[PDB]
Structures are given as C-alpha cells and as structure tokens.
XYZ file of C-alpha atoms in Angstrom:
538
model
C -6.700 51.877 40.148
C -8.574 48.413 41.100
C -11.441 48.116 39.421
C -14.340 49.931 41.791
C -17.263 52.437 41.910
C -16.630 55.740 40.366
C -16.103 58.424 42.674
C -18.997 60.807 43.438
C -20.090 64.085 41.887
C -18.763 67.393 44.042
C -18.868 70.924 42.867
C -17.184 72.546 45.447
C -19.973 75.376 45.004
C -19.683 77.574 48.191
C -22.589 78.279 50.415
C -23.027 81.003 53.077
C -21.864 80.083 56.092
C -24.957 79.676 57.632
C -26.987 77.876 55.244
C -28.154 74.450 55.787
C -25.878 72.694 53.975
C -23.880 69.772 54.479
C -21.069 68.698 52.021
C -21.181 64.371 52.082
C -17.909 62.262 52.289
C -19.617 59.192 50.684
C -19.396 55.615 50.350
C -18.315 55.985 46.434
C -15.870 58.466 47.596
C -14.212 56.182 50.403
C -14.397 53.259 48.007
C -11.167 54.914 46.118
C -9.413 54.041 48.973
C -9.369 50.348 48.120
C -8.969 51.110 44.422
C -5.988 53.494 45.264
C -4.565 50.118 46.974
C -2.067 47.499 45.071
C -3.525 44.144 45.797
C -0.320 42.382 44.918
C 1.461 44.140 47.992
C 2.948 41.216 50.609
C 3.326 40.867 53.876
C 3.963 44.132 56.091
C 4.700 46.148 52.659
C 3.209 49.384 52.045
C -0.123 48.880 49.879
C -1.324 52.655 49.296
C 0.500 54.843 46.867
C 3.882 56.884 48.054
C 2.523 60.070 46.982
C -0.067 60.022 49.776
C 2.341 58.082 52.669
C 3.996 59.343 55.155
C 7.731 58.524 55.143
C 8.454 55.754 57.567
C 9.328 57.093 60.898
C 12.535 55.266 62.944
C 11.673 53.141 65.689
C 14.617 54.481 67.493
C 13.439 57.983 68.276
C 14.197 60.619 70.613
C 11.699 61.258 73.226
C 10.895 65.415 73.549
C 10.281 65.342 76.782
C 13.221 63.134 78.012
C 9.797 60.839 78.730
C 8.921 63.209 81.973
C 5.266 63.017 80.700
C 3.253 61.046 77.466
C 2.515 63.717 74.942
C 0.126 63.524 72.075
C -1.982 65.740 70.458
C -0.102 69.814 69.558
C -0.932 72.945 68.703
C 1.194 76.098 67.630
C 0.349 79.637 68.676
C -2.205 80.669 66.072
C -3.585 83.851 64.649
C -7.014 84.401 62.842
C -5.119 83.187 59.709
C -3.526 80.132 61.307
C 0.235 81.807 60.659
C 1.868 80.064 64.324
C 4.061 82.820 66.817
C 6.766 83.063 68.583
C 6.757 85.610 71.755
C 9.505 87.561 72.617
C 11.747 85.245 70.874
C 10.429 82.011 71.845
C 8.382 79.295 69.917
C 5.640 78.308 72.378
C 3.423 75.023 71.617
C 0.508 73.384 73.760
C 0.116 69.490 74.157
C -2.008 67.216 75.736
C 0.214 65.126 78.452
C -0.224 62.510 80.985
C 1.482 61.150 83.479
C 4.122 58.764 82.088
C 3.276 56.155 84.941
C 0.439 55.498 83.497
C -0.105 52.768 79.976
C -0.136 55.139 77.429
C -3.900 53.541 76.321
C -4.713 55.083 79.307
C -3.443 58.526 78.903
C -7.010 59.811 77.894
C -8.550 60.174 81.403
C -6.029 62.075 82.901
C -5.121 64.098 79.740
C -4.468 67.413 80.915
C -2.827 70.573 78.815
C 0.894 71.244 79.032
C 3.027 73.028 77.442
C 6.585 73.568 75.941
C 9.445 76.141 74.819
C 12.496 76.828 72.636
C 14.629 79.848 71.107
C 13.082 81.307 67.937
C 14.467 82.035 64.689
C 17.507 78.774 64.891
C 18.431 77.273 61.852
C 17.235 73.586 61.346
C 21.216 72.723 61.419
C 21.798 74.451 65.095
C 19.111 72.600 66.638
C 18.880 69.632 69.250
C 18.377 66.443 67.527
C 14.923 66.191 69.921
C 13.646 69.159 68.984
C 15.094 71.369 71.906
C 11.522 72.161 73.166
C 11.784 72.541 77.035
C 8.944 71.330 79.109
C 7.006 74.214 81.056
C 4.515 72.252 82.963
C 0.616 72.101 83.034
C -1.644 75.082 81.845
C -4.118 74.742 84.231
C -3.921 74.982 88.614
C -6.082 71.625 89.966
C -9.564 72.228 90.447
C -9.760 75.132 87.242
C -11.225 73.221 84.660
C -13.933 71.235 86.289
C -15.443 74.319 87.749
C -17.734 74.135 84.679
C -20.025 71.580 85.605
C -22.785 71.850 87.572
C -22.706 67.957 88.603
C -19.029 67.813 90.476
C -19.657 63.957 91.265
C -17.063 62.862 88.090
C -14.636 60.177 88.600
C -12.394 61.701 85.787
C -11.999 65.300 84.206
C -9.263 66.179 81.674
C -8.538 68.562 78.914
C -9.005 67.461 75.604
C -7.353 69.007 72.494
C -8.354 72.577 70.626
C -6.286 75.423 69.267
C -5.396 78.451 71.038
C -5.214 82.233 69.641
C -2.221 84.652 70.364
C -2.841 88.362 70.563
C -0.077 91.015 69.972
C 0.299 91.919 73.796
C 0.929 87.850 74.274
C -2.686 87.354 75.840
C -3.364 83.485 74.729
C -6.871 82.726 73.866
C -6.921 78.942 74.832
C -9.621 76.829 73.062
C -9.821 73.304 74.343
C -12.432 70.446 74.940
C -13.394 70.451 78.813
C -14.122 67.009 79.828
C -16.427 65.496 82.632
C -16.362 61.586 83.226
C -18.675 59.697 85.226
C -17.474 55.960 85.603
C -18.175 53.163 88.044
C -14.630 51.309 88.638
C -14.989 48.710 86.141
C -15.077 51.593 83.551
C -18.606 51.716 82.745
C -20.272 54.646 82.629
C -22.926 55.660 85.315
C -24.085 58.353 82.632
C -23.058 59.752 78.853
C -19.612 61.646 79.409
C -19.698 65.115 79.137
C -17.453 66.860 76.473
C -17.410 71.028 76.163
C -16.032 73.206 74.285
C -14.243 76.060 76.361
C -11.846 78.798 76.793
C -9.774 80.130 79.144
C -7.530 83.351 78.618
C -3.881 83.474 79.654
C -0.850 85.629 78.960
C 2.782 85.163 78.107
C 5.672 85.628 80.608
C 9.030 85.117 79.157
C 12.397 85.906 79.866
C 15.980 84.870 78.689
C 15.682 82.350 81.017
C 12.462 80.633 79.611
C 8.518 80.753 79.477
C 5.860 80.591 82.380
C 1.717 81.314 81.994
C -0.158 83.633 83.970
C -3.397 83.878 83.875
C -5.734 80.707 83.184
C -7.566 80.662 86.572
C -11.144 81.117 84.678
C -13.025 79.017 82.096
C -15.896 79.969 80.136
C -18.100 76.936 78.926
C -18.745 77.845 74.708
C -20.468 75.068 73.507
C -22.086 71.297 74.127
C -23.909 68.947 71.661
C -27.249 70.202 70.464
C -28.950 67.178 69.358
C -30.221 68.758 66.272
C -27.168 69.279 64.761
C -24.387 67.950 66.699
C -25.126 64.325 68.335
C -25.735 63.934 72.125
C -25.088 61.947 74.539
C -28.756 60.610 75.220
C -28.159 59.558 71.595
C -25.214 58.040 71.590
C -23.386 57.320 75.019
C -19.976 57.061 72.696
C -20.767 60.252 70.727
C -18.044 62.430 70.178
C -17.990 66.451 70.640
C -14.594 67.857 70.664
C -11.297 70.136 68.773
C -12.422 73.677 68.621
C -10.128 75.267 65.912
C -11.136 79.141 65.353
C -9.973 81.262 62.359
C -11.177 84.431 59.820
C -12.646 83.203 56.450
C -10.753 85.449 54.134
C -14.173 85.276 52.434
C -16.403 87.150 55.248
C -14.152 89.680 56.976
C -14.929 90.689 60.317
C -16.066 87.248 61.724
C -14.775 84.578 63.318
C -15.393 80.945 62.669
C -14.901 77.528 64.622
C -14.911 73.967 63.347
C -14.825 71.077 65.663
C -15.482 67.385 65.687
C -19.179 66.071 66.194
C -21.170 63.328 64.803
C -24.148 63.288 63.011
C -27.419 64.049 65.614
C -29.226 61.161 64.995
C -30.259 58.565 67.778
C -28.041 55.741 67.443
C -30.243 52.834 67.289
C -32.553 54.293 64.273
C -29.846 56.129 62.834
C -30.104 55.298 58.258
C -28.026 56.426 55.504
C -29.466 57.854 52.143
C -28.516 57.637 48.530
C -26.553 60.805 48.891
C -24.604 59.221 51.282
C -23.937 56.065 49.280
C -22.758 58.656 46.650
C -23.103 56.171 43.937
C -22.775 57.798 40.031
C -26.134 57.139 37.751
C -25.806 53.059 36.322
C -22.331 52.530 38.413
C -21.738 48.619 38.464
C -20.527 48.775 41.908
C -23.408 50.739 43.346
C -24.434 49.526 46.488
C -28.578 50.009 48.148
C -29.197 51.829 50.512
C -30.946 49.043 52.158
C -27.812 46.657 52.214
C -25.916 49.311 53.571
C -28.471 50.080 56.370
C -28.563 46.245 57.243
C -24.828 46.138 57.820
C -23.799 48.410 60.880
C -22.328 51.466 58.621
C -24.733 53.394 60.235
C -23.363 53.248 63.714
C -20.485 55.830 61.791
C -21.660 58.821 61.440
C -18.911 61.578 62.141
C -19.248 65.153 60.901
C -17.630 68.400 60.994
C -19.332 71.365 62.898
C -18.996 75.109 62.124
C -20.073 77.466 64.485
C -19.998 81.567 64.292
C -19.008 84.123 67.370
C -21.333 86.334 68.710
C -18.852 88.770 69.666
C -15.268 89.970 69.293
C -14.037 88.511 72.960
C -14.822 85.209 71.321
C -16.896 84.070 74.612
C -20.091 83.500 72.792
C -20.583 81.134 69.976
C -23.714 79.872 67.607
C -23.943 76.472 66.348
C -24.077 76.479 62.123
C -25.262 73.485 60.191
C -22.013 70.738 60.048
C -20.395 71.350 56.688
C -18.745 67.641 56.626
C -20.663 64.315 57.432
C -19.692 60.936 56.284
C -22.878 58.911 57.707
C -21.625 55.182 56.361
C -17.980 56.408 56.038
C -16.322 56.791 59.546
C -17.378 57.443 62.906
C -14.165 60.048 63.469
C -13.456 63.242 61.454
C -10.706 64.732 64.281
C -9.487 67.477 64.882
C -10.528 69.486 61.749
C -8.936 72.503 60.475
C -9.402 74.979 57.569
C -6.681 75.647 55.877
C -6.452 78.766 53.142
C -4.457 78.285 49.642
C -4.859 79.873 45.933
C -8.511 81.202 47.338
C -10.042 77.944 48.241
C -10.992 76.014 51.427
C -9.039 73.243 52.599
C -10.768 71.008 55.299
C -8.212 68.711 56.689
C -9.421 66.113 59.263
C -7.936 62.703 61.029
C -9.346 59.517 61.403
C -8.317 56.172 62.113
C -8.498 52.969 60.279
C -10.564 50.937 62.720
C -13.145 53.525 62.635
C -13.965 53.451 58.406
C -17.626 51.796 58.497
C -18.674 48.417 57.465
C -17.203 47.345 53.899
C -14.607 50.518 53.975
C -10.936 50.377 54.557
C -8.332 53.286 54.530
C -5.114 54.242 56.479
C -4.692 56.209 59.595
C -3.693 59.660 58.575
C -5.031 62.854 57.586
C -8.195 63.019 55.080
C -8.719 66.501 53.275
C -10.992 67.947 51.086
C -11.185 71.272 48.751
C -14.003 73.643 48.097
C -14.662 77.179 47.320
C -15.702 78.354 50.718
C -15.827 76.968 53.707
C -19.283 76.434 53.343
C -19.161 74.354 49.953
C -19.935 70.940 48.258
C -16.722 70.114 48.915
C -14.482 67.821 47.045
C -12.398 64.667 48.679
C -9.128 65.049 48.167
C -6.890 62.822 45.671
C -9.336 60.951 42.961
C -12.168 61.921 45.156
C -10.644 59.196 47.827
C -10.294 61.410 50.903
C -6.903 60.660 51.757
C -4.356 63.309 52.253
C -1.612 61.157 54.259
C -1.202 57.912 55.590
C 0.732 55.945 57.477
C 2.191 53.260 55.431
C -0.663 50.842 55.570
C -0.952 47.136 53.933
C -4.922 47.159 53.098
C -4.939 43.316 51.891
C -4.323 42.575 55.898
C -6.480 43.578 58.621
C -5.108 46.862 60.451
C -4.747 45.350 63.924
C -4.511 47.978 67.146
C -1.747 50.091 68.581
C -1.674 47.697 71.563
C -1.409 45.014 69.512
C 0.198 44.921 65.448
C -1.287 42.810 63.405
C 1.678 39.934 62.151
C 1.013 40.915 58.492
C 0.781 44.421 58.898
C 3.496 47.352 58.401
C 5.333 48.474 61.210
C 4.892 52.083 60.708
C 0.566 51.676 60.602
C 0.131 53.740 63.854
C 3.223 55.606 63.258
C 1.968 58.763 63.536
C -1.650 60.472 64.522
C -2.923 63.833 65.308
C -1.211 65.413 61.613
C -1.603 68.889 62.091
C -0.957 71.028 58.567
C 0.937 74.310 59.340
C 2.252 77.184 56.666
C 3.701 75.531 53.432
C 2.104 72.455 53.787
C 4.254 71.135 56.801
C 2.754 68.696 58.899
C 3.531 67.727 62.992
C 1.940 64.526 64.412
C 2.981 62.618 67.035
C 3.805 58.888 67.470
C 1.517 56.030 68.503
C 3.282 53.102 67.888
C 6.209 51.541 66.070
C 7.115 47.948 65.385
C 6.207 44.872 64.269
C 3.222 42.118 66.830
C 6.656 40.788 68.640
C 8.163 43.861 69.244
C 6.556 47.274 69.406
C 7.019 50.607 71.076
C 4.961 52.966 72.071
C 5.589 56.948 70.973
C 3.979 59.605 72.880
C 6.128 61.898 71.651
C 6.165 64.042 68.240
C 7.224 62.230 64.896
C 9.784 64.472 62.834
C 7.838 67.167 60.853
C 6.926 66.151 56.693
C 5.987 67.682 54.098
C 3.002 67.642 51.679
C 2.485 69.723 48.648
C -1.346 70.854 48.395
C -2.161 71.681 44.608
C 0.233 69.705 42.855
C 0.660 70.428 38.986
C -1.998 73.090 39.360
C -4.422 70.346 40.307
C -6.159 71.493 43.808
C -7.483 68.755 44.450
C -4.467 66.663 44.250
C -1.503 66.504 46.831
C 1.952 65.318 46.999
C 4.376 63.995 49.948
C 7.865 66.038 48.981
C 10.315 62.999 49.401
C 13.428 65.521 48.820
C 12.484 67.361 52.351
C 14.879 66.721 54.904
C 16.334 63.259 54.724
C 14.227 61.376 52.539
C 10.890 63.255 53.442
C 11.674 63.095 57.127
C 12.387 66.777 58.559
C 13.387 67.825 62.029
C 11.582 66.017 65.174
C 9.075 67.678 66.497
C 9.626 70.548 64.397
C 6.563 73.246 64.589
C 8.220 76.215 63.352
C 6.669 80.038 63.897
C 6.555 82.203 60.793
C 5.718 85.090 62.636
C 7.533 86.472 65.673
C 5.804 89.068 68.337
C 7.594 91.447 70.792
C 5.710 92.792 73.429
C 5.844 94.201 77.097
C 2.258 92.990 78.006
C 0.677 95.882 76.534
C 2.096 97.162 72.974
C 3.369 94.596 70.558
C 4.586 94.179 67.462
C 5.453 91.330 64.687
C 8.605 91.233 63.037
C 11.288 89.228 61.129
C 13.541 87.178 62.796
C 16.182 89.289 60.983
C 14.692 92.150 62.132
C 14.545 90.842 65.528
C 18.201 90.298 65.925
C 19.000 93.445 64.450
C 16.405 95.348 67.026
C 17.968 93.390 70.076
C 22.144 94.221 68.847
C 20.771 97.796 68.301
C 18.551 98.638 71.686
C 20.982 96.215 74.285
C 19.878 95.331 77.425
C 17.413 97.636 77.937
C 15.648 95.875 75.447
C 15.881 92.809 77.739
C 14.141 94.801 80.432
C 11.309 96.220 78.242
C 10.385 92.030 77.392
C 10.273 91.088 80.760
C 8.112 93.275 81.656
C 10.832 95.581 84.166
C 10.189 99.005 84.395
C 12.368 101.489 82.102
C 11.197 105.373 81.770
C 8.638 106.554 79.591
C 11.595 108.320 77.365
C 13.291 104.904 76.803
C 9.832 102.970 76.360
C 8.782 105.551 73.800
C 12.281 105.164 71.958
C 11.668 100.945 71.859
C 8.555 101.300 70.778
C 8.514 103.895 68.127
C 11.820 101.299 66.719
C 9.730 98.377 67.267
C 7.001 99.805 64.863
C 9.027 100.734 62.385
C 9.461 97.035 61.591
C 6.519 96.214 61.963
C-alpha cells in the first residue's frame, strides 16, 4: 500500500431491518483505493492489484444477439434465495435492449426489456461460442408500461433494469424501474424525470421449439422517491431511483426484502457531509475536515442503498426502510445492488463508475462489495476496507476518460465491462461498454464472457479473489448465466429437479411428457402418473 489514511472502523454488527440505521462507505474507506494503486504503473498498464481485476476481455468479441438490438444490463430467473431457473428445460434471462440504429450513448431513452433463450443443462464444451442465447423479443406490448403515470405528456418512457422472481408454475414476477421522461428537443428537461419502481406478472410458454411470454399486459406502480429517505426529484433534478432486487433474509423467515439504488434525500444545493462520513481513524495524518471536504463539490455525491419490506405475500405492496448503504462524499452511484448470502453473512454488492467517485477520490469501474452480519449491519468495505470487489483494469495515475472517448494514457479494457452481476459460486455476468484504445475503440452492447471471483478467500470474509485458473485464463464462456436449478411445470403443478434427473424423467415418460410441458391436454390418468414421477425428484 501507498502511504494513505487508515481505513475506517466497521463492526459489521447487524441491526433489525427496520431500524434507522445506515452503514457509511467513507472517505477513509475509498481512500484505499489509491493506496491499493502502484504509482510506478506506465502508460495504459493496469495500476490496481490482479486479485481484484477483471481479466482483460478481447476486443474481437462475438455479439449475442448477432447485433439485432444493443443489450446491456441482465438478469437470471431468480428465486427468494437468488438460485437462477431454467423452465421446462430452458435457461431464460431478461435484458435491457435498444434499437441498434440508435448510438449506443443513446440507448437509455428507448431502453425497453427483452428477453432471451437457450437449452438447459449443456456442457460448457457443447455450447455456441456466443453463448447460444436466442433472442425472444420485447417483454412488454407498446403503450403497457406508461399506463402508470398520471401525466401522459412524456417525450420518452423506457424500462429500466430490476430482477424478476420465478414461481414453480413458471408465473414470472417482473421487477423493473418504470421510467417517465419529460424533455424539450434540445434534451433539457421541462420537469425532474420520473423513475418507479414496478411490477408486472407474466408466465412462461415454452416448447421444443423455443420460449414466448404471456401475460405482462398490467403494471402495478411499488414505489417512488420519498424525500425523507430516498432523494427526489424537487431535490435533485439528476437524482437517481432505480434496480429493485427482492429476496428472503435467511435471517427473518417469512418476509421479503428489496434493495434498490437511491441517493441520499437531501436537497442538492445545501446538501454537507459529517465526520462519520469522512470516516477518518482518531490522530490519522491524512485526515481530512469536514469543512474542506464540504467546500469542494463531494457533496453533490451522495448515492445510497435503499431497503424496503413487503406488505404482503403477492409482493404488490412495499414499505420504504431506512437506506442501509450511503457514501455521502464517496460516489454519486451505488447500482444495481444485490444481497448476496455466504457462510451466514450479508454480502452487499453494488456498481459504480469511475467518473462518478467524488471530489479527491479515484477507483475503477467495477463492482464494490461489502460484508456484514445482517443485512441490516455496520457493514464492512470489502478488500482492506477499500470497497472494491472487481475492476476493470484501470491505470489510476491517468485520468479515466469516457466510453465515447478513451483517454490516450489509459487501458483499453477501462469500460470493458459494467453491470457485474454475482450469481451462485461467485460467478459474475456483465456486459461490455467499450474496448480499445482513443484511436480505435468499439463499442460492446453485448455480454462480456462470465468470471469468476472467490468471496472469503483464506477464511478471510472480507477479502476476495479473481480465480485466474477459470476458463482460459479467468475468462469463462460469453455470456454465460448458468441456472442451478431447473423447473418443470404445465402452468399449474411444478417441480425442481436435476438436470440428470431431468433427462432421465424425459427418456422415461416420452412424448407424452412433451405434451404435459406445453401445456396440451393428456388425461387425468396420464397427468397423475407425470406428476406423482415428477415429485418424486423433487
């Protein structure tokens, strides 16, 4: 390590979940980014340390989509303990995608929700170099989504990313961020856009032939910033309020939780930080005041994490909690959080950009992650109380430049990869930004291949570890999001079994277990037989 401020003091003491308080990613914490950092790396080299980078993804990539649409952020079929599903032997993921006419900077206007398809239960050695995930088309009929809003004059309305639940009968719970715009033609906005957090139920239809949707023609609003806890838009025209991922806390049976992206609710303008954000140890020589840091524009970053409880078991109803994650003077963006369960404690992984660290900070884009004993708890940054979990590779003795434009000194793999997504085993899907050097770049909009990081290494928690021996030098399949559990249903009784199992179940029943999955009719004797099979595996 550079010589620096110490980290700062966690716990990771667990609250209740609805107890006000919030866990601080602080300045002191952040600061072991740039002590992390080799100083003596050159020009477009890797500065951070390999144990927390993301292998260097190939500029010559397949495209997943056979570029049809842009595709960016991804999420698996989850259940209430994130384990991702196939249905009736296919692996089904959701994406936002645009139109591939468009600049892909522009994609996030007309984002809308799409989704794809392959065969469960291949081998990573029988499968398509791309991925073999066929495209299936938009969630959503036009008109659907924006039937939320009760001011219909918008100039733009997408879907924005979230999570979405899978029951045993294939009925998809879709959680997504419902999105209003209201823009004059030079961009500016005419008023504060207007994120929501929503659902809208759908069901599975598959066949050997492939996947379609039903369902989807209703949404039900959830959630919009508060102002007390969550940040509005009267108090900050840019705030952000999106990313609804829902799961069981091992720790309180019987509820379900939802985190999300928010910032901090205070009004922009008069927004301060505190010595508890500044995080500095008792008599550190790199302390910094809290009035310097006020003076210098950190506060304008003031990101948090939100939690918020269901009121019932349809999941339609939902009460804000205190945010258990703020960095106020850290970073204006903690995306697309999710908890994530291993050796009974609480892993909060979140993304965030480097452009977005506040004023005197500097990290990589990537995934930042942090350990505690509940999800509730005064939780603990990950890796020498830094933060970082994975990053691109990133030179931090050059500035960071933009995916629309690489900065000459800066590594070519810096916007590599965004959107990391931690699955089972500590595999992580993101998809590509950019890749290349200021004279000659590419954009992605596609998934990177899959990675994999080790959470706990060397029976450490709080430390983590990129596995360089997985697939070919740490790179796995592309756009590899793998089920580990695998449903068979007719609509109405389902069950989840092994892939093993599955095959075995299908070579013993024949076609008439072909019928049963599509949903044809067969006679209560022969439904009775599948079933009564079907739950003895399960």
């Amino acid at each position: 390590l550079q010589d620096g401020p110490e980290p700062s003091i966690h716990t990771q003491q667990a609250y209740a979940p609805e107890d006000d308080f919030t866990a601080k990613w602080t300045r002191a914490d952040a600061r072991q980014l740039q002590r992390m950092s080799d100083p003596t790396a050159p020009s477009r080299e890797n500065s951070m340390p390999a144990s927390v980078t993301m292998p260097t993804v190939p500029q010559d990539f397949p495209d997943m989509s056979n570029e049809q649409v842009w595709v960016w952020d991804t999420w698996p079929l989850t259940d209430e303990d994130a384990n991702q599903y196939s249905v009736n032997g296919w692996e089904i993921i959701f994406s936002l995608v645009a139109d591939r006419n468009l600049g892909f900077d522009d994609r996030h206007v007309f984002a809308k929700i799409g989704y794809f398809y392959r065969p469960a239960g291949v081998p990573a050695a029988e499968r398509p170099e791309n991925g073999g995930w066929t495209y299936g088309g938009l969630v959503f009929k036009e008109g659907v989504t924006g039937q939320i809003f009760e001011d219909q004059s918008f100039s733009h309305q997408t879907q924005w990313s979230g999570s979405a639940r899978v029951s045993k009968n294939g009925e998809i719970k879709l959680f997504f961020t419902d999105v209003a715009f209201y823009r004059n033609s030079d961009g500016t906005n005419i008023k504060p856009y207007d994120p929501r957090i929503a659902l809208s139920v759908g069901k599975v239809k598959a066949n050997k032939k492939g996947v379609t949707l039903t369902g989807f023609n209703k949404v039900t609003d959830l959630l919009q910033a508060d102002g007390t806890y969550y940040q509005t838009g009267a108090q900050n025209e840019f705030f952000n309020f999106r990313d609804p991922f829902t799961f069981e806390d091992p720790a309180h049976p019987g509820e379900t939780f939802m985190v999300f992206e928010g910032n901090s609710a205070m009004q922009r303008e008069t927004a301060t930080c505190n010595e508890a954000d500044l995080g500095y140890r008792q008599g550190d020589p790199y302390a910094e005041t809290v009035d310097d840091v006020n003076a210098s524009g950190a506060t304008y970053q003031i990101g948090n994490v939100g939690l918020a409880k269901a009121k019932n078991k349809q999941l339609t109803e939902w009460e804000f909690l205190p945010p258990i994650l703020s960095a106020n003077c850290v970073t204006d963006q903690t995306e697309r959080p999710q908890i994530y369960f291993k050796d009974g404690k609480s892993y909060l992984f979140t993304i965030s950009h480097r452009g977005t660290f506040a004023a005197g900070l500097d990290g990589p884009e990537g995934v930042y992650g942090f350990v505690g004993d509940g999800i509730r708890s005064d939780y603990q940054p990950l890796n020498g109380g830094s933060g970082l979990a994975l990053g691109n590779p990133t030179n931090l003795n050059f500035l960071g430049g933009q995916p629309f434009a690489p900065d000459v000194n800066q590594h070519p793999g810096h916007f590599q990869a965004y959107s990391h997504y931690v699955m089972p085993g500590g595999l992580v899907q993101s998809y590509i930004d950019t890749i290349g050097t200021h004279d000659d770049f590419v954009r992605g909009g596609t998934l990177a291949p899959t990675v994999k990081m080790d959470i706990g290494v060397g029976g450490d928690s709080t430390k983590t570890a990129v596995d360089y021996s997985y697939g070919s030098e740490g790179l796995g399949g592309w756009a590899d999001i793998p089920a580990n559990k695998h449903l068979f249903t007719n609509g109405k009784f389902g069950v989840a079994v092994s892939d093993e199992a599955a095959q075995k179940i299908r070579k013993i029943l024949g076609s008439k277990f072909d019928d049963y999955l599509d949903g044809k009719p067969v006679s209560a004797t022969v439904r009775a037989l599948i079933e009564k099979l079907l739950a003895q595996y399960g």
